[PDB]
Swiss-Prot record:
Subunit structure: Monomer. Oligomerizes to a heptameric ring, known as the apoptosome, upon binding of cytochrome c and dATP. Oligomeric Apaf-1 and pro-caspase-9 bind to each other via their respective NH2-terminal CARD domains and consecutively mature caspase-9 is released from the complex. Pro-caspase-3 is recruited into the Apaf-1-pro-caspase-9 complex via interaction with pro-caspase-9. Interacts with APIP. Interacts (via CARD and NACHT domains) with NAIP/BIRC1 (via NACHT domain). Interacts with CIAO2A.
Domain remark from Swiss-Prot or TrEMBL: The CARD domain mediates interaction with APIP. The monomeric form is autoinhibited in a closed conformation through a bound ADP at the nucleotide binding site. Exchange of ADP for ATP and binding of cytochrome c trigger a large conformational change where the first WD repeat region swings out, allowing the NB-ARC domain to rotate and expose the contact areas for oligomerization.
Disulfide-bonded cysteines: none
Induction: By E2F and p53/TP53 in apoptotic neurons. Translation is inhibited by HNRPA1, which binds to the IRES of APAF1 mRNAs.
Distribution of this protein across tissues and organs: Ubiquitous. Highest levels of expression in adult spleen and peripheral blood leukocytes, and in fetal brain, kidney and lung. Isoform 1 is expressed in heart, kidney and liver.
Function, in words: Oligomeric Apaf-1 mediates the cytochrome c-dependent autocatalytic activation of pro-caspase-9 (Apaf-3), leading to the activation of caspase-3 and apoptosis. This activation requires ATP. Isoform 6 is less effective in inducing apoptosis.
The organism's place on the tree of life at top rank: Eukaryota
Record gene name: APAF1
Protein name listed in UniProt: Apoptotic protease-activating factor 1
Length: 93
């Protein structure tokens, strides 16, 4: 569903993302945008640590469409993760 460029960007920067991001905030945006289901939210929330939640959310997004990548970018950007957003800018469709 997603462009290779986007996929690879995510795969390249996932460790950096997994490290810093507060997943619940990003998810709230993505749920608002309608690219993330309550069931998916819960599955992420079921992960014990923030890094494990982040990893799960990214694993999920890698199985979604271009729109979802952008939603993720927008979320990061609106939550002030400007550095991490920049890393994914090059891969945006």
């Amino acid at each position: 569903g997603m462009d290779a460029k986007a996929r690879n960007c995510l795969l390249q920067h996932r460790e950096a993302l997994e490290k810093d991001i507060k997943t619940s905030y990003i998810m709230d945006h993505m749920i608002s945008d309608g690219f993330l289901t309550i069931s998916e939210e819960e599955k992420v929330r079921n992960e014990p640590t923030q890094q494990q939640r982040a990893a799960m959310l990214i694993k999920m997004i890698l199985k979604k469409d271009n729109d979802s990548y952008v939603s993720f970018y927008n979320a990061l950007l609106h939550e002030g993760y400007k550095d991490l957003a920049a890393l994914l800018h090059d891969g945006i469709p």
